[PDB]
Symmetry: C8
Subunit: 137 residues, 8 copies
């Protein structure tokens, strides 16, 4: 399981070092792809595989289903975690999430989310209460 | 099955001593995270695991689902219960729930909720009848 | 199966002697918690376990679901039935149901309900017909 | 299966003799409780067991469900069928259904219904057609 | 499977001779009960057992369900088919269906229906088309 | 597979004795006896007993406490019959049935996979004459 | 040889036979079932597959007027034909007329079955009929 | 698992060279067919098989289902991937997608999509946000 918030820094080669606590969870490689609200998601391949199936339960004959699948999977990537537990983030992905220097990794149980510290805080700053949001589920 | 109410105190080092009755239930570590109505939830890891699944059953393509999951899992933590049955409560969590000194532990079968004594009493003070509430389920 | 009505007395030490017919059903200990309409329910732990699950099928993201779970499980207790088949009723529970002296135990198949004789009679006094109530189910 | 109509008499000691055809069906004891329209139902414990479960499928958080369950099970009883195939009918039940002298036992497959002859005839005298009632199922 | 239409006679002792084609299907005894539209239904006990179950899927807490069950099972009877394959129809049932002399047995796959010839012809004379009726299923 | 599928149209004749000769292709499918009963739009359906058995069950899924279900069941099963196919593969059609469908001389048997339908030639052509398009009817399913 | 795909232009000879495209011949064993399709086309299936297609119908009322018209219009016209050694199929006359078959056929694979079309009718079908996207959106 | 974006060229003989990463996934042959928004899909035959089944869950008695199936499968093609990992794209398909020189292969987990670079870039240029689209699923 993946939980918690971590504050790390994007190094000069666009890599991120997995927090050791987290590094355990991930084997030799991960699938990265772009998330919602400008964040980049990280997953073990096995989990990436199961996330995807949750999509195939979507029409596909529906225009939006295709836009969604296109925006997600054409940007997913497969990266290897190096011995030091670092992940080189793809160029395009570094841009999609406005990554720069100062990353926040948040555990999402299933996956990891990589954010730009300022964007993440803004996200948190806006966005309603845990109670307000939950009542609507 | 965690049941009952317990009055306890947050010590100087922000630790809480599990009620012995309750300490049995909890093995070496637990997951903590913030709950609803400002309370902090405690769970055996495997129970936290099952709680999460109950979420994945939520859209995810929905904005609210994401806000909910981010609000919850970003603040979950994994704490070790020490030999004496004490748990050091993370600072951020100490603030989320206005924890101070004088905590209330309530069993919730599934998990534990840690409350500020005043807040919890006010919560009970407000909030309708067991019957009024049940009729709406 | 727990069936029937039994008139008993709350002794000096706040204990209740299980009717022997009923004592059988219950092994070494029971869970007690407060019921609806001021009554205190009694169950075999295994049965309390099954009763709880029937709750987990409730939202949880819903405010009312939490109120309900909090009002119920924070007052559940786990009591041991002594050799003479007596159960010491927790103070808080003795107060919730206006227990005093002169109890009524009614079998509810699944559980047992402990009433204040007066309250129970009034409850029966009010409350519509078996047919009137069944027609609405 | 319990079928048919039987005219019998409530003896002086409030006992009823099972019609022999019927006595077969019932082993050593039965559960008795009050029925709808003032009648008293009789069942093999095993069957009473199954009947109850059909209730557990009812809210319980609903006020009516609790009234229904209290009205029914608080009056259920467990009686032993004597060697001569007689069942002593509890006093309270003798009153609920205006039992007196002259009973009617009607098989309901699942259970037996004990009626006051006059009340039953009046029930039949009123009540719509088999077709009219069926069309509404 | 019982099929066909058969013209038979009610003998002076209120007996009917099962059609030989039909008698085979029916072992030593049958359950009889009153049908819909004044007809009397006949079934092998096993089949009656399965027909009943289809009812237990009806509320029971509903007044009409009870009237239906009562009207049906209070008149069900269990009759032995004699060696010559005859069935002595109970008095009450002879009157319910206005049985006189001149019966009509119709196969209903599941059961057999005993009708008064005239009543049946009238039933057929009224009642809409096979298509009209089917369209509404 | 021809022993498992009744397909096709066959023009045949109702002989003097009210018998129909099963087309040989079809006769294979049916064993020694069949169930006959009246169909919809005046046609008479034919089935292998075990198939008739499965058809019926599909009915038990209907209320029964419902008046229309009973009328349906009565109109169908009171007129079902069980007929033995003779050695020459002929089936004697019950009188009542012969009348229900206006059978006379000049029958049409159409394969309906599950069962066979016997029609009066004129009636069948008229049925076909009316009735909408394959497309129009399917759009409504 | 597992799924039928593609478009094929072929000819209906004077004896009313069509030659299965070889690619498609594999897929079909000794015989096929033919029947009339929608939009005037004639469908072809291995019998096992025809069997499976029918079941999908039994999931339809039957007590419903339309269900009967549909079944009558389809199965009364199905036919069981043998694919000769050269891989040809002799199309039943009645079917030849239902689809306005003449000379110049189009076979399109439909995974499950094959559809035999009149070249002109098929082109027109295609000329009309909306976009892949427009149609999909409505599923 | 097909992921990513790849820029490639349609050679003179209308062939495309599978990116090596991708060539692994695909065995000896693929099925091609035309996709939505003018793109051509590619799949291992087994996957093509599974994608089709997802269609059979559509009416068939519905005019649109037939159009959709006709438009798709009448243009599917089965192509062999040569030793050098090249696929000869059917002329008709080359025209459907306005393929020319300069293709973009995007992974779609399930299949591959072949696009004309300009068309693909325009598609992306228009088309709403990842979030906006997801919200509607």
């Amino acid at each position: 399981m993946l939980l918690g918030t971590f504050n790390i820094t994007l190094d000069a080669k666009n890599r991120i070092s997995l927090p050791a606590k987290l590094r355990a969870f991930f084997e030799g490689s991960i699938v990265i792809n772009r998330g919602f609200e400008n964040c980049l998601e990280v997953r073990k391949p096995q989990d990436f595989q199961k996330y995807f199936e949750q999509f195939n339960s979507f029409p596909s004959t529906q225009k939006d289903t295709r836009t969604l699948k296109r925006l997600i999977f054409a940007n997913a990537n497969f990266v290897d975690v190096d011995t030091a537990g670092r992940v080189l983030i793809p160029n395009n992905l570094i841009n999609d999430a406005k990554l720069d220097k100062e990353i926040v990794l948040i555990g999402q149980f299933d996956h990891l989310e990589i954010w730009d510290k300022k964007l993440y805080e803004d996200y948190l700053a806006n966005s309603e209460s845990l109670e307000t949001v939950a009542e609507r589920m």
